[PDB]
Amino acid sequence: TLRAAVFDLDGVLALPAVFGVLGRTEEALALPRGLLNDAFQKGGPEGATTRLMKGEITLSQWIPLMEENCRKCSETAKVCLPKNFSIKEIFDKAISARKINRPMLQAALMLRKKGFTTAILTNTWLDDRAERDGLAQLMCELKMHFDFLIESCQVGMVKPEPQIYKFLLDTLKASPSEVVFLDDIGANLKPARDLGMVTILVQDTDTALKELEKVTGIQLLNTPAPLPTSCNPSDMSHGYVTVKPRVRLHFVELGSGPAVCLCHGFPESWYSWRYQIPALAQAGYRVLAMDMKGYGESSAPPEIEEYCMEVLCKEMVTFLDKLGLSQAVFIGHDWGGMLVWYMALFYPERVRAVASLNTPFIPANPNMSPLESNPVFDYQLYFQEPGVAEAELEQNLSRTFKSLFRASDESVLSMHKVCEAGGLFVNSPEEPSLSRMVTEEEIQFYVQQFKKSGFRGPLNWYRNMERNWKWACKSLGRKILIPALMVTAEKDFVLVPQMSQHMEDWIPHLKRGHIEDCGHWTQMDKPTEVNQILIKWLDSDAR
Amino acid sequence: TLRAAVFDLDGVLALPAVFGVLGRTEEALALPRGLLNDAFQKGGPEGATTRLMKGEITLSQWIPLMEENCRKCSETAKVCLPKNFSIKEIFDKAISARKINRPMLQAALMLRKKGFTTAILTNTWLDDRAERDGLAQLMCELKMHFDFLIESCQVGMVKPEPQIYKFLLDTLKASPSEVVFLDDIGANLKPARDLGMVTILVQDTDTALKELEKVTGIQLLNTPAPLPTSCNPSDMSHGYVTVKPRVRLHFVELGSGPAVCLCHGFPESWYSWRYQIPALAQAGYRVLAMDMKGYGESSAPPEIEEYCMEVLCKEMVTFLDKLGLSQAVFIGHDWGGMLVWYMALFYPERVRAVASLNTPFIPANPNMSPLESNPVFDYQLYFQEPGVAEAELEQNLSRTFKSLFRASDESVLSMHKVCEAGGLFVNSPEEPSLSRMVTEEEIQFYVQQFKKSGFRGPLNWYRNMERNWKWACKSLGRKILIPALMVTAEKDFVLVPQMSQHMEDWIPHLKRGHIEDCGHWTQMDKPTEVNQILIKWLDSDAR
Numbered sequence A, B: 001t002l003r004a005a006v007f008d009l010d011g012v013l014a015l016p017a018v019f020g021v022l023g024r025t026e027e028a029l030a031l032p033r034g035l036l037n038d039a040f041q042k043g044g045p046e047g048a049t050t051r052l053m054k055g056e057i058t059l060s061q062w063i064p065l066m067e068e069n070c071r072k073c074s075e076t077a078k079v080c081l082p083k084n085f086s087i088k089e090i091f092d093k094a095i096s097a098r099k100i101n102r103p104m105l106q107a108a109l110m111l112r113k114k115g116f117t118t119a120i121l122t123n124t125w126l127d128d129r130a131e132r133d134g135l136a137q138l139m140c141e142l143k144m145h146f147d148f149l150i151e152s153c154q155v156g157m158v159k160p161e162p163q164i165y166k167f168l169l170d171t172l173k174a175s176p177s178e179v180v181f182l183d184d185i186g187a188n189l190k191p192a193r194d195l196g197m198v199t200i201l202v203q204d205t206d207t208a209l210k211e212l213e214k215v216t217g218i219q220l221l222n223t224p225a226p227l228p229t230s231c232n233p234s235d236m237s238h239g240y241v242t243v244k245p246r247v248r249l250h251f252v253e254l255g256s257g258p259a260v261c262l263c264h265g266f267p268e269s270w271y272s273w274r275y276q277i278p279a280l281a282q283a284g285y286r287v288l289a290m291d292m293k294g295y296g297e298s299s300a301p302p303e304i305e306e307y308c309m310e311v312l313c314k315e316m317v318t319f320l321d322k323l324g325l326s327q328a329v330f331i332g333h334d335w336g337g338m339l340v341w342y343m344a345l346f347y348p349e350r351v352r353a354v355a356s357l358n359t360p361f362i363p364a365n366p367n368m369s370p371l372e373s374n375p376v377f378d379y380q381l382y383f384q385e386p387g388v389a390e391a392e393l394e395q396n397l398s399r400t401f402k403s404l405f406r407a408s409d410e411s412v413l414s415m416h417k418v419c420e421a422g423g424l425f426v427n428s429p430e431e432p433s434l435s436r437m438v439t440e441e442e443i444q445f446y447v448q449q450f451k452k453s454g455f456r457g458p459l460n461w462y463r464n465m466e467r468n469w470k471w472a473c474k475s476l477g478r479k480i481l482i483p484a485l486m487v488t489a490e491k492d493f494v495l496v497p498q499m500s501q502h503m504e505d506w507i508p509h510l511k512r513g514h515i516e517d518c519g520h521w522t523q524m525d526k527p528t529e530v531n532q533i534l535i536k537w538l539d540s541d542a543r
């Protein structure tokens, strides 16, 4: 019974294969067939390429040795190498042309999700070219999806030497009959075969996956669309900044490039951006996913006024200052979306670009205090009285999140007549069913985050209605002229798309996004669509 | 008795003043004298510029209003504005031309060091131009050096209205006679004067500083060279990454741009880079100052083999992977310098550029085990026996750091015949004097860091001599071909400049740095020189 899957890099997990490009260059340069591939392999176990693959020498020290092998090979074939012949150029272009074989990575991901141990076993070199970052970027995106990465240059052993296969077996803690080994080179497949491993000679990906599906019994081809990569909380870099005595802000950080500040809603976590964090990082951004004040590992002072928009915004500015960031792109959802419009309104200098998921920008009415409103969205009135909603929401944490985190068609909670009913969960079951959006594990992460501070801090965000209105009134003569994106979600019955209709009177250059069949919990409801809209907008409006 | 100093931004803390550029543009465009400055101030308290300074409108909404004021002013003067006349261009160039007035910032820093409360009071706008990052960068570098930053657009009040001066007084918690107010505009100086504040009309910086030195009694002009900005540990962003179960790495992070990994020596801290962290961040780099394994807030497992170079290097790679960084510039000192050469040797793909302070690169001798050596640098033998050196170094933490952290001429500890003497501190006083390099406060920071794990982890770095040699021997055929810098320190009697003499046989493209009258503790001994060498090398060899 198979329990481990081993994949090669070149010609398996990454396409096109550099070996195939040597053949491509020889036909373009009208060189004799095999000349370059033969120069590459000259002296076999005793040759220059074996030394490079064993980590004895670096790529740059190898270029001159390959040049000599090429010259010698061309002399015995009685041909001439062209005038501009350069192994450096040939290999630079080859390495750069090589991209991830997405369907092969997808199948490796599927096998691992089904409890398989996965590994990359590759004959590779120590890359010291000025262009090495290209390969380092490829290796990083690939390695994260596997249990092990075995590189010849790191272990001092090469395929097809038997020791590397015995090394692989020991690393996997598996018997040979328990392993599927996938390779594009017949020769490197034979020693795995001799030990008794299942072997797949990869030419075209489809046939290779048909063989892999047949032998594993797991559907690898024609599967439904997978979810984007998520976050394992213990694998993240956790950051902490003291913004004022007694108030410290927690964040998760991933990637390099322009800074992207992710601001969650009520009653959420940095973890609500789990499907965005890896995608935006891979897209070339330095993601900072916040635990907003009152939540998770961030401070939760008890006082109501500590959660007014003015204070939260000033603290976000201090957060940038202490991290030494002149600007960040501010992306918010729900209450985070509200903060985000205010950051753009009050601190346009510190906001590269601003994006809101669901939460529209509506200017304060200077003639009417918002406290005056009305049982249509009465959860607001219910959230006002300190202690009441804290008691209901903290009673059973697991029930709170299973009742709240529900998709469009999953019998969502009523937001009307909640004061009359005397609670949010008064017509909800004691043991709600688990939503298709979340696992029991993800629900339990939220449960643990809420055990520290509870719901006072989070609810205090609803308790500064008049204070926020007074401050919002100071911005009545301003417009938002920095890059802005408004993302509406069709089936959000609290933050309705229609509520956003007039935003263009105040944000003339506003760009829009729209998600059909999407409820309130946008990030987890439609992560694939959210990531597409955000990345396209970031690459155009935020560099 | 004065206890607070208040500074204006334009024409005081930042030069040239935008108002002076309006006069510059009018003489270049052959416009009537004062035309643009008069258009700028049109309608005074009721005008467009007052609205912009009160935060009623943003810069972009103001450009059209200034255009109209210019057209109206040119009509009454019976002149024509040129064909390409644009307030946008005039202001973009003006804002960008404005740089920090270094001698004025220096004096504000001096006054604050002497216990003065310092503040910036400025008439400023809400900048929403595409070019806003320039001003945001200027404001960030300036604001950090002051107790308060008061901006008209943020408080809804403007100079010369009396309320802003009363607001300033309340913010400073000071009586008027306790405050020095410095401004370049006579009109904005008069209300401070009326309240009873000491006022300085700033034209040229020298006369302004002469008046300021005379009234405060503190030498502000002709002072010796100040040290670079340091780090207040509680003002930093603290990052944590789990690299393997039970091993978590702590780091301090500051800045944006290419990633720069700072690796301290024995027995140090991230804090040893205190004078570099702000300088390299300001230079346009994302600094990550490590607490190396065994130190501070990083994990300190007890086992010796957990501190061999192979494991420390693999963990540094995992650190990059978890932060989602394909590369970092690796800068190391002492044992960190050793790690750094190995990162470049074993993982050139993950190292953008490599720099070592004091620690040379010397290839392992494959014919001789380094355990065989010799009482000349016998502190190595002394550090071998587990428990011995831990007991001496932990007995009195304050004494350990006061005895170790000493400048070239400060009667440094003997590194010879330490086994014969039976300890490092056997000929050292019980109460050492405080070195000119460190304050009692900085010594006490190290003391607190060492109370957690002690010296087992740090000493275990010296306990893998044979293991490191065996691994180093695998790299004997390689050269370092990535960008590299070797910084020698004249008076380092353990890591001697002469020890680095042959490095060019293995690092042909090696760039060098050299620090005269510098001991072992390079970063704190010569911070100004270290920062100059590092920044020049980073901007040329690391982008």
Ligand SMILES: O=S(=O)(NC1CCCC1)c1cccc2nc(-c3ccc(C(F)(F)F)cc3)[nH]c12
Residues within 6 Å of the ligand: A266, A267, A334, A335, A338, A359, A377, A379, A380, A404, A462, A494, A495
């Ligand atoms: O309170 S608001 O000002 N209401 C406005 C918005 C539309 C009508 C009035 C408000 C303002 C901005 C964002 C908001 N997100 C929520 C909300 C979120 C989750 C839950 C749940 F957890 F119960 F599901 C209930 C309410 N409310 C928000």
Ligand SMILES: O=S(=O)(NC1CCCC1)c1cccc2nc(-c3ccc(C(F)(F)F)cc3)[nH]c12
Residues within 6 Å of the ligand: B266, B267, B334, B335, B338, B359, B377, B379, B380, B404, B462, B494, B495
């Ligand atoms: O142990 S080494 O291999 N010695 C080599 C280096 C030159 C001769 C042999 C070694 C290798 C690399 C870096 C080193 N930094 C120190 C050191 C640092 C501080 C203290 C102090 F805290 F005591 F001051 C004592 C010794 N030693 C190092």
